[PDB]
Protein backbone atom coordinates (compact mmCIF):
# COMPACT_ATOMS: atom_id res chain seq x y z
CA UNK A 1 0.00 0.00 0.00
CA UNK A 2 1.13 3.53 -0.88
CA UNK A 3 -1.23 5.03 1.73
CA UNK A 4 0.86 6.55 4.53
CA UNK A 5 -1.82 8.91 5.89
CA UNK A 6 -2.01 9.11 9.65
CA UNK A 7 -0.66 10.19 13.00
CA UNK A 8 2.25 7.85 13.77
CA UNK A 9 3.73 7.35 17.24
CA UNK A 10 7.24 6.07 17.61
CA UNK A 11 7.69 2.49 18.80
CA UNK A 12 11.37 1.85 18.05
CA UNK A 13 14.40 4.05 17.26
CA UNK A 14 17.79 2.66 16.21
CA UNK A 15 21.01 4.65 15.56
CA UNK A 16 19.30 8.06 15.64
CA UNK A 17 22.47 9.54 17.17
CA UNK A 18 24.63 8.13 14.38
CA UNK A 19 22.47 9.85 11.77
CA UNK A 20 22.61 13.15 13.68
CA UNK A 21 26.39 12.84 14.01
CA UNK A 22 26.67 12.37 10.24
CA UNK A 23 24.78 15.67 9.80
CA UNK A 24 27.24 17.35 12.23
CA UNK A 25 24.49 18.28 14.68
CA UNK A 26 26.16 19.75 17.74
CA UNK A 27 26.87 17.70 20.85
CA UNK A 28 24.29 19.32 23.12
CA UNK A 29 21.43 18.99 20.64
CA UNK A 30 22.27 15.36 19.81
CA UNK A 31 22.51 14.33 23.46
CA UNK A 32 19.04 15.72 24.25
CA UNK A 33 17.41 14.66 20.98
CA UNK A 34 18.50 11.00 21.15
CA UNK A 35 16.49 10.56 24.37
CA UNK A 36 13.15 11.56 22.91
CA UNK A 37 10.08 9.84 21.57
CA UNK A 38 8.95 11.11 18.16
CA UNK A 39 5.64 11.64 16.38
CA UNK A 40 5.21 11.74 12.60
CA UNK A 41 2.04 13.24 11.09
CA UNK A 42 1.53 12.55 7.38
CA UNK A 43 -1.22 14.19 5.33
CA UNK A 44 -1.37 12.55 1.90
CA UNK A 45 -3.69 13.35 -1.00
CA UNK A 46 -2.62 11.99 -4.37
CA UNK A 47 0.96 13.10 -4.93
CA UNK A 48 0.64 15.91 -2.39
CA UNK A 49 2.28 15.26 0.97
CA UNK A 50 2.53 17.27 4.17
CA UNK A 51 4.87 15.68 6.72
CA UNK A 52 5.47 16.86 10.29
CA UNK A 53 8.08 15.32 12.60
CA UNK A 54 7.72 16.33 16.25
CA UNK A 55 9.13 15.73 19.70
CA UNK A 56 9.18 17.79 22.86
CA UNK A 57 12.34 19.38 21.36
CA UNK A 58 11.68 20.04 17.65
CA UNK A 59 9.03 20.60 15.01
CA UNK A 60 10.08 19.95 11.42
CA UNK A 61 7.52 20.35 8.64
CA UNK A 62 7.91 19.76 4.91
CA UNK A 63 5.46 19.81 1.99
CA UNK A 64 6.18 18.18 -1.35
CA UNK A 65 4.67 16.68 -4.48
CA UNK A 66 5.89 13.23 -5.50
CA UNK A 67 8.09 13.48 -8.59
CA UNK A 68 8.58 17.27 -8.43
CA UNK A 69 12.06 18.42 -7.50
CA UNK A 70 12.27 21.18 -4.91
CA UNK A 71 15.06 23.27 -3.47
CA UNK A 72 15.02 23.08 0.29
CA UNK A 73 16.55 24.69 3.35
CA UNK A 74 16.75 22.11 6.11
CA UNK A 75 16.05 24.81 8.73
CA UNK A 76 16.48 23.78 12.39
CA UNK A 77 17.79 20.32 11.47
CA UNK A 78 21.20 21.25 10.03
CA UNK A 79 20.66 24.59 8.21
CA UNK A 80 21.79 23.36 4.79
CA UNK A 81 20.50 23.89 1.25
CA UNK A 82 19.65 20.74 -0.71
CA UNK A 83 17.81 19.80 -3.90
CA UNK A 84 15.17 17.31 -2.82
CA UNK A 85 13.13 14.77 -4.75
CA UNK A 86 10.58 12.27 -3.42
CA UNK A 87 9.59 9.29 -5.58
CA UNK A 88 7.89 5.89 -5.32
CA UNK A 89 9.97 2.74 -5.67
CA UNK A 90 7.21 0.17 -5.53
CA UNK A 91 5.46 0.96 -2.24
CA UNK A 92 8.56 2.57 -0.66
CA UNK A 93 8.50 6.37 -0.53
CA UNK A 94 12.06 7.51 -1.24
CA UNK A 95 13.59 10.95 -0.66
CA UNK A 96 16.98 11.95 -2.05
CA UNK A 97 18.43 15.27 -0.89
CA UNK A 98 21.29 16.27 -3.21
CA UNK A 99 23.94 18.47 -1.63
CA UNK A 100 27.04 18.49 0.56
CA UNK A 101 26.26 15.19 2.29
CA UNK A 102 26.41 11.90 0.40
CA UNK A 103 23.62 9.30 0.58
CA UNK A 104 21.30 11.81 2.25
CA UNK A 105 17.57 11.26 2.44
CA UNK A 106 15.00 8.86 3.81
CA UNK A 107 12.66 5.99 2.96
CA UNK A 108 9.22 5.23 4.39
CA UNK A 109 7.01 2.19 3.92
CA UNK A 110 3.98 0.52 5.52
CA UNK A 111 4.01 -2.96 7.10
CA UNK A 112 0.43 -3.65 8.14
CA UNK A 113 -0.26 -1.55 11.22
CA UNK A 114 3.12 0.17 11.29
CA UNK A 115 5.19 2.74 9.41
CA UNK A 116 8.87 1.96 8.91
CA UNK A 117 11.41 4.69 8.24
CA UNK A 118 15.08 4.81 7.28
CA UNK A 119 16.99 8.08 7.69
CA UNK A 120 20.32 8.09 5.85
CA UNK A 121 23.36 10.37 5.74
CA UNK A 122 26.87 9.38 4.76
CA UNK A 123 27.46 5.84 5.96
CA UNK A 124 24.86 6.06 8.76
CA UNK A 125 21.38 4.57 8.71
CA UNK A 126 18.78 5.25 11.40
CA UNK A 127 15.89 2.78 11.49
CA UNK A 128 12.55 3.72 13.06
CA UNK A 129 9.15 2.07 13.52
CA UNK A 130 5.92 3.92 14.27
CA UNK A 131 2.47 2.65 15.23
CA UNK A 132 -0.68 4.19 13.81
CA UNK A 133 -2.59 6.18 16.41
Ligand SMILES: *C/C=C(\C)c1ccc(-c2ccc(N(C)C)s2)s1
Pocket residue numbers: 033051053058059060062076077106108119
Ligand atom coordinates in the same frame (compact mmCIF):
# COMPACT_ATOMS: atom_id res chain seq x y z
C1 LIG B 1 9.90 11.52 6.67
C2 LIG B 1 10.68 11.89 7.92
C3 LIG B 1 11.21 13.09 8.10
C4 LIG B 1 11.13 14.16 7.09
C5 LIG B 1 11.96 13.45 9.36
C6 LIG B 1 12.12 12.47 10.35
C7 LIG B 1 12.93 13.13 11.52
C8 LIG B 1 13.19 14.49 11.20
C9 LIG B 1 13.85 15.27 12.09
C10 LIG B 1 14.57 14.70 13.16
C11 LIG B 1 15.22 15.78 13.98
C12 LIG B 1 14.81 17.00 13.38
N1 LIG B 1 15.26 18.19 13.91
C13 LIG B 1 14.75 19.35 13.40
C14 LIG B 1 16.22 18.16 14.97
S1 LIG B 1 13.95 16.77 12.14
S2 LIG B 1 12.60 14.84 9.83
